A paper describes a structure:
Ribosomes are the ribonucleoprotein machines responsible for protein synthesis. Here, our goal was to investigate the structural conservation of the Enterococcus faecalis ribosome compared to Escherichia coli, a model organism for structure-based development of ribosome-targeting compounds. In the analysis of the E. faecalis 70S ribosome structure determined by cryo-electron microscopy (cryo-EM) to a global resolution of 2.8 Å, we find that structural differences are located predominantly in peripheral regions, while the organization of the functional centres and antibiotic binding sites remains conserved. The cryo-EM structure of E. faecalis 70S ribosome presented here revealed that the architecture of functional centres and subunit interfaces remain conserved when compared with E. coli and S. aureus.
In addition, we used focused classification of the 30S subunit to identify five 70S conformations. The 30S head domain is significantly rotated in four of the five classes (15.5° to 19.7°) resulting in 70S conformations with large rotation of 30S body and head domains. The experimental density for the tip of helix 69 (23S nucleotides 1912–1916, E. coli numbering used throughout) is visible in classes 1, 4, and 5, but absent in classes 2 and 3. In classes 1, 4, and 5, nucleotide A1913 in helix 69 establishes extensive contacts with the decoding centre in the small subunit. In our E. faecalis structures, the molecular map for the flexible linker region and the C-terminal domain is well defined in the unrotated head conformation in class 4 as well as in the rotated conformation in class 5. The superposition of both structures confirms that the C-terminal domain retains the same interactions with the 30S head domain in both conformations. This suggests that the bL31 C-terminal domain moves as a rigid body with the 30S head domain and that the length of the flexible linker region may restrict the extent of head rotation that is possible without breaking contact with bL31. We found in the E. faecalis structure that contacts between the bL31 C-terminal domain and the 30S head are maintained through a considerable range of head rotation consistent with a function in stabilizing subunit association.
Author numbering:
A (entry chain C): 2 to 276
B (entry chain U): 2 to 90
C (entry chain 4): 1 to 44
RNA sequence: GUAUGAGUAGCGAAAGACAGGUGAGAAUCCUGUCCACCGUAUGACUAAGGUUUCCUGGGGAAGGCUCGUCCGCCCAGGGUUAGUCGGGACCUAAGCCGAGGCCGAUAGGCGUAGGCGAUGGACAACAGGUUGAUAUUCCUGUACCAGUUGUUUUUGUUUGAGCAAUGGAGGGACGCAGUAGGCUAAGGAAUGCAUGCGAUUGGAAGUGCAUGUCCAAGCAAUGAGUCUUGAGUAGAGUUAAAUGCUUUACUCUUUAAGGACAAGUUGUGACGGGGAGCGAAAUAGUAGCGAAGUUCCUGACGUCACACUGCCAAGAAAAGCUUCUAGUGAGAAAACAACUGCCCGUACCGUAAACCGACACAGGUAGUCGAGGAGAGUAUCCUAAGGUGAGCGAGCGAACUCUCGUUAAGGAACUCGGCAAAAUGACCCCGUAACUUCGGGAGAAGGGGUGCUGACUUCGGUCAGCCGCAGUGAAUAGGCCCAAGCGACUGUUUAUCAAAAACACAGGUCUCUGCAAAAUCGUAAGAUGAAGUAUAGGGGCUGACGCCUGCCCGGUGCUGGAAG
């Protein structure tokens, strides 16, 4: 659930965090870990491209299947773990051959389920099915864009989808943010919404907890001198003197729809609603 | 080429005291192993192993005539023996 | 307080060395521009 | 080049005095005695950095803020020894170069394989002695690692003898916080050896003064303890294979047993070297001779050891090592003896007069050790081991300036302003308001006790007595209360005039963005975003929390539209 700390100091008045009452062990496996850096938003050239990065804790990858290309072999899932990378949890997997890997953990997976992955596999939680063998109205994740990449669509915590219906080609899918498009008939999926629901329900509280997560403070626009931001200058507190408030490069903030106007996907998208 | 191994013996206050325990202080040219000096001494004096020790020297200043110049590098060699002597020096 | 010219031996020859002035086409300009005067110390 | 200022300012924080030396010449050099300063450092060891400043013997023209027989200065000679220490012939992180390659007016930019790169991993020696300077380097004794030559007991290359992969796998392999338990070091106190008995009243012992009160690596034996369940049957997998490794089902088994690690102890080493003190044989406290090795008390974040519990911010790689097969394939593999083991650094200073500041400069410099009496303590006062007495003085004791100590009577009248000073301050005990987000305010305010001797006492203190003006008698150690604006808060800011009412901040709200995502650096290749995927990611504004966030779409921007 959600903790509420009793208010003792000033920097503990409003803190909240999860119980972590869903996680069984506290040790990963050796063979599924790979290192990382903190790029701090810096290139090959080593300049700050994306602002406000760098200066937190240490991490390692947990190499996670998005493909699920073994079929007709039952998989035993034992332990649920924690990611520093992802809002959602992971799970160990014991194939009967003796092959291990990590897999994203949806809601309702218990310790000791068995998940089947072929194109003939049934309809429960955690099964791997291509987007032809799925009936209308289910709730689906790891929707693949291209056939053979593994998942790229909806991955993070507490999100969902539906299949609104089929065509002969392609499949209609309601994603999150209300919108619908056309995804092929050779794309894998997993039946069921992803796990943790509660990552909107946490107060970071301190500043130093938001710097435990790898962030850095964002100075307002109107306080900069007039050569670091176009809102700047002015003696006293000033209103936005320029029409249509501006990012520090150009490109007004509130209003510019900025896709590529000649995008290839425009044939396949229906009801571009909430962006 | 082992007659350009050894140049000179050193005649100092410690070097005469090395003579009492069959130890001898020679100057060996640069880039020479311990093993060349063993082979050269056994070639030139019919004595044995009981291993060599090898130093180096950093140079100095001197001044003569408003001029400033170094001196050479060196390399000593303190060779010990087992059974023979050198009443040669 | 701390002042500037705090010397090392790795930095004064992995910045101002010779093997970093025969590795560009500007270190070569520097070496060839110093040899016109006839300077003794060419680099470090 | 030379004046004036002018023989003026200054001579860069600190305690010296005398006797005797040497010498043409002495406060400033040598020696002796007493006094004084630091003693979590002005004491010891090393990493950078410096580059001969180190030692021996001479010298006094210049340097030394004075003098100088002296010196970190000048001349001459002379000193740095390694199979085991730190680095190379071993491995990899950040990063850099990058055969081919992909882009680009030239120049060139980026990058796979392969590499280079310690601040990290892995790795075989300990104690003492010795010189004017070197010592895990020389010698003395006892070891260890990897090899080579003669001896040592076994033959198809099938392996039943071996070796054995650049492949199969295990292992190396890791955070923060908190107290608990065991050993050793170091520490303290006494009735164990040594010498001598006070010349100021008194003191043979005991109830006495000064001084010393031990030992290695390695090899044998053991072990306070700590961690971990083990076995079988039937199949999947490990690019071919495997007795190795992994894994699914079934049957048992469990404080049991098997296994793994372990600070430390006892012998040996060791008839050894160490030592209070004696002391020559020349001119040396030199050579040479050595007595004790006890018990109790306190006792470590040093070691077991990241061992254990807890928590979320979820805590490096590759090699060395170990097995199994692939394979190669006269017959090597224990004991004994004798030999071999390469290159670079090693002097010195190293909280400084030898480094960084133009200086022999009141500043800065990473790591380890860091004693005693009080004491929570590395605080504070005085001291041990040790090291210094500061590189201008002698007189006199006026003005004035600076740094200190005291004051009658009054106690903010001074002043822009109680600025500066004065006052409180240690431990124990009694007691403690409005207000509130129920945690606080709170060390709220305001009061009381402290020294020495005796008895009682389980524990804790009580009772009696004694002295002074004053009993945490020295040094260290919060002034308080009532109201009000501003900002919620701890934080951050103009190195060198501004530390705040400024910025950040948790929270709120709007907007963009379906993945070759928007955005950014670049001409592009490429890269960041991100090995992330709308509970995510970028952009603008407001800045905990409580109550709220009215009216206007005519104008300007944004978004949608299709007829003209």
């Amino acid at each position: 659930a959600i903790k509420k700390y009793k208010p003792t100091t000033n920097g503990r008045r409003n803190m909240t965090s999860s119980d972590f009452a869903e996680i069984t062990t506290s040790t990963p496996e050796k063979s599924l870990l790979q290192p990382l850096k903190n790029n701090a938003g810096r290139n090959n050239n080593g300049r700050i491209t994306v602002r406000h990065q760098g200066g937190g804790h240490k991490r390692q990858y947990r190499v996670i299947d998005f493909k699920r290309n073994k079929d007709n072999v039952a998989a035993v899932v034992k332990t649920i773990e924690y990611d520093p990378n992802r809002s959602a949890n992971i799970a160990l997997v014991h194939y009967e051959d003796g092959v291990k890997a990590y897999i994203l953990a949806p809601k309702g997976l218990e310790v000791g389920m068995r998940l089947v992955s072929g194109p003939e596999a049934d309809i429960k939680v955690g099964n791997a099915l291509p987007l032809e063998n799925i009936p209308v109205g289910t709730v689906i994740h790891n929707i693949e864009m291209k056939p053979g990449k593994g998942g790229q669509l909806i991955r993070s915590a507490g999100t969902s989808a539906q299949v609104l219906g089929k065509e002969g080609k392609y499949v209609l899918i309601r994603l999150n943010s209300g919108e619908v498009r056309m995804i092929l008939a050779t794309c894998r999926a997993t039946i069921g919404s992803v796990g943790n629901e509660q990552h909107e329900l946490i107060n970071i509280g301190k500043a130093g907890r938001s710097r435990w997560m790898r962030k850095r403070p964002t100075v307002r626009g109107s306080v900069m001198n007039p050569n670091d931001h176009p809102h700047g200058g002015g003696e006293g507190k000033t209103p936005i003197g320029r029409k249509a408030p501006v990012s520090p490069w150009g490109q007004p903030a509130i209003g510019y729809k900025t896709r590529n106007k000649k995008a290839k996907s425009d044939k396949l998208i229906v009801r571009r609603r909430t962006k | 080429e082992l007659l350009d191994v050894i140049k000179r013996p050193v005649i100092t206050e410690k070097s005469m005291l090395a003579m009492d325990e069959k130890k001898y202080t020679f100057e060996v040219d640069t880039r020479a192993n311990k093993t060349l000096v063993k082979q050269a001494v056994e070639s030139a004096f019919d004595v044995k192993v009981a291993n060599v020790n090898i130093l180096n020297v950093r140079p100095k200043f001197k001044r003569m005539g408003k001029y400033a110049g170094y001196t050479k590098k060196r390399r000593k060699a303190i060779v010990t023996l087992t059974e023979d002597s050198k009443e040669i020096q | 307080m701390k002042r500037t010219y705090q010397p090392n031996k790795r930095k004064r020859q992995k910045v101002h060395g010779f093997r970093k002035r025969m590795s560009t086409k500007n270190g070569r300009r520097v070496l060839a521009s110093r040899r016109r005067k006839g300077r003794k110390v060419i680099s470090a």
